[PDB]
Amino acid sequence: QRTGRSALAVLIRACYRLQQQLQRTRRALLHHSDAVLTSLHHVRMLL
Amino acid sequence: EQVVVLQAQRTAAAAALENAAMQAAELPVDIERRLRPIERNVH
Amino acid sequence: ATALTEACAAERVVRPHQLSPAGQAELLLRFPALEVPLRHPRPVLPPFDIAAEVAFTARIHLACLRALGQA
Numbered sequence: 001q002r003t004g005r006s007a008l009a010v011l012i013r014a015c016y017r018l019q020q021q022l023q024r025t026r027r028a029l030l031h032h033s034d035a036v037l038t039s040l041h042h043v044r045m046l047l
Numbered sequence: 048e049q050v051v052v053l054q055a056q057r058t059a060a061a062a063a064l065e066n067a068a069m070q071a072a073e074l075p076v077d078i079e080r081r082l083r084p085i086e087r088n089v090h
Numbered sequence: 091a092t093a094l095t096e097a098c099a100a101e102r103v104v105r106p107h108q109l110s111p112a113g114q115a116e117l118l119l120r121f122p123a124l125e126v127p128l129r130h131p132r133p134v135l136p137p138f139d140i141a142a143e144v145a146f147t148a149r150i151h152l153a154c155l156r157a158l159g160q161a
Binding site: 048051056 | 144148149
Binding site for chain 3: 037038041042044045046047
């Protein structure tokens with residue numbers, strides 16, 4: 001009973017967190033990349 | 048009067064590019080260290 | 091420096107005097123320091139510029155030329 005039910009919990013903790021790791025890379029690469037577009041629009045404001 | 052303004056504005060944003068060029072030089076960096084600890088994770 | 095660019099980047103406007111008054115009043119609610127460069131008739135410096143000092147020494151230079159040639 002404890003052999004098959006706990007060995008799958010290895011792959012439970014892996015799959016539900018890889019769903020979470022790619023969500024931060026959606027956010028942290030848009031809250032960083034918009035600063036680039038913030039900087040480039042600022043340079044045109046100087047001109 | 049306008050030349051003294053128009054010249055100083057052009058030399059201004061010339062400096063702001065190199066602040067942005069060192070700022071936008073991390074985009075080929077910032078993609079690499081986010082994918083590679085997930086590729087070895089799958090592999 | 092974050093808000094004054096993004097409020098103009100959302101509207102595709104190069105100078106914050108050309109911003110819509112619906113957008114201009116939003117910055118005044120958050121940031122009350124922007125009263126004078128937004129709601130003043132004749133500022134001695136040109137507001138929201140970069141050579142605004144550099145314009146200022148060039149205007150006294152002109153005013154001292156016409157003080158000579160008229161006299």
